[PDB]
Design a binder for this molecule. Sequence first.
Ligand code: HEM
Ligand code: HEM
Lengths: 448, 441
Amino acid sequence: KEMPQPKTFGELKNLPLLNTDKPVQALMKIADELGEIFKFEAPGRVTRYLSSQRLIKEACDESRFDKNLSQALKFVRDFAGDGLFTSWTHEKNWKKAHNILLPSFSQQAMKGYHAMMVDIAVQLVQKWERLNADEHIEVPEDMTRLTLDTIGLCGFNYRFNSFYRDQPHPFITSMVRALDEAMNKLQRPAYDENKRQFQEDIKVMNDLVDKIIADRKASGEQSDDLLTHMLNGKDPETGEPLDDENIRYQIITFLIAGHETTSGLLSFALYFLVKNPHVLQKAAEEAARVLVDPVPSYKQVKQLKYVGMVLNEALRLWPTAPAFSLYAKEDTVLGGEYPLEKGDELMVLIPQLHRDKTIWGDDVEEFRPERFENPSAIPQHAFKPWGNGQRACIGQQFALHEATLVLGMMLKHFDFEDHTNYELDIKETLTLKPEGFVVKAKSKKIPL
Amino acid sequence: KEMPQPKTFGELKNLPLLNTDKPVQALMKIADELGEIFKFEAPGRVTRYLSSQRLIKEACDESRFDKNLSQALKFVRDFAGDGLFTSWTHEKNWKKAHNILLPSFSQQAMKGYHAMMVDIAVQLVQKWERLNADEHIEVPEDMTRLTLDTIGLCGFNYRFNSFYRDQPHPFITSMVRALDEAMNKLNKRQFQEDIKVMNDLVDKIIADRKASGEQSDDLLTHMLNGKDPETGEPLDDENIRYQIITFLIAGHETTSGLLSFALYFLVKNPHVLQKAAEEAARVLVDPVPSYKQVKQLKYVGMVLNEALRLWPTAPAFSLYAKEDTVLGGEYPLEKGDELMVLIPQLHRDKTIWGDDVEEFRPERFENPSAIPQHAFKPWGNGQRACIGQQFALHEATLVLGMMLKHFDFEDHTNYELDIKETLTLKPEGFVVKAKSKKIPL
Ligand code: HEM
Ligand code: HEM
């Protein structure tokens, strides 16, 4: 009846218990002590963290709870605007863009992005093929190079050329610095340079994207990217198209929502494979059996079943956008025991949900891809790395097609060594990633 | 590509090879002679018995094969209905009951059943503590008294009081007579009367519970309160009754058989008994075992897995091909063709376990992670695997642990193993003498 809550320390409330730069991991330990639900207060706010499948199934009821824009999302909204990720469900542009963009993110639509994803995936393989004997790979760095370039090419036919550079394209440098500033604002005279840089970074981003939109309208070119689709699509509901300003925000939004979530997933998957050589072997065996052509076809990517299972299991242990926020649309009672008032906030703690022992068995820390051999049997709302319902990840199919393709090619072309015996260090920002994860690859010398 | 087949008897096909009191043991000898797959036919039917991990791993692929209701399961369905064990995976009540009952069978849920399991376990140990010096124990008989009573208390808070009688409670008599009849079919008046004794009692307990409004720690409470997350519907009262009958039918003899075979292997291997008794003495430091103490009985758990490796008490399960497919690159099958997994023979696969497969060595389970996928399958497979796996193991670990703490055992008759076959396996006539260590209980 009364909601569990950690010890409060006078006016600091529960704040002294989260003195870390890894709040999700610390929250997971509080959940281990207090259970499926706890309230957490700090001087400014009140939130409630949910961890069990039984209560998350209720939180995922869209007639009762809707997506809440957390303080992180409101800060990201300063450059992501009313793009899909940082808009409220009730905003007109949320619904218009959702309806217009769904068909361009479907599984069927991946067939059209496939050649551009293969283009960047070949650049990564060649990079690693061309390393001399004494070098090594920086995993999350290379994966981020890949996902940024893939989203840029597939999103608006623009090449950041990240594998040609030490220093990223100026757009990228400004987007990542703006994102970093947005997240750093959470924990805050001498912030005047921060502010001016943020405004400069926003201007860099808007100018380039507005310029690419204007160039495309002026040429009439039609391409296999999302920009063509947004320029020509009309919302079936209102009959209206997106305006140019919103199309820019969607472009920025695809990059910010997709770049690190997807690179983190590839990095965590490669981490789990090198730490479990028998799993790596089974995945590599499938890659060799399936990828018989010089470059993978769309159909071959879809037959990489075990590779997909490895990605799902990496997502189960370390979902790379680890928490999403919801608000009660109306007064309601959660689980028959906890009364909530209209507007009360809930946080879904995804990694902890994914460790619910009543669903997955007592062995939740083990890396076992076989858990996903029959997806249809997993209980409803037990596995939620893509968020929920109409506010779920629109990029799901794109992220999985990209990651499946890339990991399959990695496993086909190289043998991997965890030459430093890397100790997992999970950095938390908007996303999760195995910071400093490094490997050596040994070419299998299989021609592209 | 050509599949072996044992002797045929004209129009009787292979049928007469199973007109024996021990058909699974006869099938194992045929597997010994014919290898990893053989065709077995009867008048209106065909099945293929599989024995190797290589072929059984493919049979366990749920995109290709699903559970088949064997003839034994269809006969058991006369009294178990559309409860979980005797339903097709595609029947609406299978998915509904599965979704609702899963969380009440997890390892976590054993925490809420532990006190009632302890109640019945203490009754068993107390019975043995009270035997005079001139007496012995009838092992499978006492293990069946314990598992029936535990499943009755944890399933629907009802006491069969099997340790208070020579002749079982009437429900038990009708259940075991009803099951024997269904197995002998592989009578009719009595069979209908035994079904009615079962339904009457179980329907009345359900009706009494709904009337009182009482909430217990049993499976009935969970079933009365649960709603299937997919449809939002609850199970109706008729299906709840079939689930209760089902828990008793599917869990009583398989679990008591496990406990009987484990004690058998321990008295036949004194060094293994002594290592298990030393763990039980170290871990079970209180007069009443706690849930956490049971979980620390790791070698006892290994002893139980090894007993299940040699004589898995539900020794065969049946599958059907979902679509046309080729098994092991050599054996083409058609949609609906049936496979039988011969578990005891799978568990004797020398390519997995080494050449010493007949030895009782609990240390094979030291590291569960090294066992190859689908090599060890006493609980069936996938979403149609035993839902009671955690309940059976918690009960057996708890009770074996207590047995080993409180008594020393003597195989006073130098018992010769005789495996009786019904729906399940057991060591018929296994008897022992237990001398108390006089440790508070
Ligand atoms: C494995 C990689 C990914 C993960 C784990 C992930 C996760 C998520 C999550 C959890 C949400 C919901 C956030 C919330 O409720 O506040 C979300 C929303 C979203 N994601 Fe992803 N994402 C991934 C990849 C991508 C990619 C590649 C794209 C674009 C190319 C993308 C674009 C979006 C968008 C636009 C939204 C907002 C959808 C809406 O509300 O209409 N994501 N993502
Ligand atoms: C050590 C003892 C046990 C063994 C060896 C065992 C074995 C099995 C096997 C092999 C199956 C699959 C049958 C098939 O594929 O046709 C099964 C299913 C089942 N068992 Fe167990 N069992 C044991 C104890 C229990 C207990 C104690 C319960 C109940 C409390 C139970 C309830 C069930 C149920 C309900 C099913 C059907 C589940 C479904 O298909 O949804 N079993 N068991």
